[PDB]
Scaffold this active site. Structure first.
Site, PDB file in Angstrom:
ATOM      1  N   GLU A  35     -29.022  62.214 -10.069  1.00 21.59           N
ATOM      2  CA  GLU A  35     -28.838  63.241 -11.092  1.00 21.59           C
ATOM      3  C   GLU A  35     -27.669  62.953 -12.041  1.00 21.59           C
ATOM      4  OE1 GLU A  35     -30.787  65.432 -12.075  1.00 21.59           O
ATOM      5  OE2 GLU A  35     -32.143  65.619 -10.356  1.00 21.59           O
ATOM      6  N   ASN A  46     -31.085  69.330 -23.517  1.00 19.31           N
ATOM      7  CA  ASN A  46     -32.504  69.179 -23.808  1.00 19.31           C
ATOM      8  C   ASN A  46     -32.806  69.941 -25.099  1.00 19.31           C
ATOM      9  OD1 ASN A  46     -33.251  68.148 -20.850  1.00 19.31           O
ATOM     10  ND2 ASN A  46     -32.088  70.066 -20.561  1.00 19.31           N
ATOM     11  N   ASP A  49     -35.812  72.946 -25.358  1.00 16.49           N
ATOM     12  CA  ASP A  49     -35.570  74.345 -25.030  1.00 16.49           C
ATOM     13  C   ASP A  49     -34.098  74.722 -25.141  1.00 16.49           C
ATOM     14  OD1 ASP A  49     -34.612  73.060 -22.738  1.00 16.49           O
ATOM     15  OD2 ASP A  49     -35.580  74.438 -21.355  1.00 16.49           O
ATOM     16  N   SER A  51     -31.614  73.906 -23.491  1.00  8.17           N
ATOM     17  CA  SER A  51     -30.957  74.130 -22.214  1.00  8.17           C
ATOM     18  C   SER A  51     -30.160  72.866 -21.890  1.00  8.17           C
ATOM     19  CB  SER A  51     -31.988  74.407 -21.112  1.00  8.17           C
ATOM     20  OG  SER A  51     -32.739  73.241 -20.794  1.00  8.17           O
ATOM     21  N   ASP A  53     -28.296  70.618 -18.481  1.00  9.81           N
ATOM     22  CA  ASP A  53     -28.113  70.450 -17.045  1.00  9.81           C
ATOM     23  C   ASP A  53     -26.626  70.138 -16.881  1.00  9.81           C
ATOM     24  OD1 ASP A  53     -30.966  70.549 -16.371  1.00  9.81           O
ATOM     25  OD2 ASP A  53     -31.065  68.537 -17.190  1.00  9.81           O
ATOM     26  N   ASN A  60     -29.614  73.411 -14.247  1.00  6.04           N
ATOM     27  CA  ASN A  60     -30.071  73.883 -15.547  1.00  6.04           C
ATOM     28  C   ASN A  60     -29.659  75.289 -15.965  1.00  6.04           C
ATOM     29  OD1 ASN A  60     -32.462  74.921 -17.551  1.00  6.04           O
ATOM     30  ND2 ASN A  60     -31.998  72.756 -17.848  1.00  6.04           N
TER      31      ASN A  60
END
Ligand code: NA
Length: 130
Positions: A35, A46, A49, A51, A53, A60
């Site tokens: 990750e 991202n 959307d 959003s 992480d 998220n």
């Protein structure tokens, strides 16, 4: 900060992750590795959307933490996403524990399913004394 392998292993163990929801320490290590590369400051935005992480576990913002800038987001861990970018990973561990308490469990992370699930991950804790 970027944790050294065994350093993270000992920390996660101290924070009660070894066997949490049936998830071994080696599996948590494998998840963090793929990750974020054990980097607490890692962020992945991202554009689709809007959003992001956050942290070592790449949690998220659309569902788990609040960053005040993700459209139609919720905050399941009831925490600011900035608390997931800290050197002290206590908050990140607590929120990761919450995530895995949902039905899907650790399978929530696509990277874990692709690089860790059903595979040998014993190497992650090799020589760590955990
Ligand atoms: Na959120």
């Amino acid at each position: 900060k970027v944790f050294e392998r065994c350093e993270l292993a000992r920390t996660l163990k101290r924070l009660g992750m070894d066997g949490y929801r049936g998830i071994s320490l080696a599996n948590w290590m494998c998840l963090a590795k793929w990750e974020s590369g054990y980097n607490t400051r890692a962020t992945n935005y991202n554009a689709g959307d809007r959003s992001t992480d956050y942290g070592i576990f790449q949690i998220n913002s659309r569902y788990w933490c609040n960053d005040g800038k993700t459209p139609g987001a919720v905050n399941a861990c009831h925490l600011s996403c900035s608390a997931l970018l800290q050197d002290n990973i206590a908050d990140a561990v607590a929120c990761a524990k919450r995530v895995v308490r949902d039905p899907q469990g650790i399978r929530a992370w696509v990277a874990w399913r692709n690089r860790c699930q059903n595979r040998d991950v014993r190497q992650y804790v090799q020589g760590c004394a955990v």
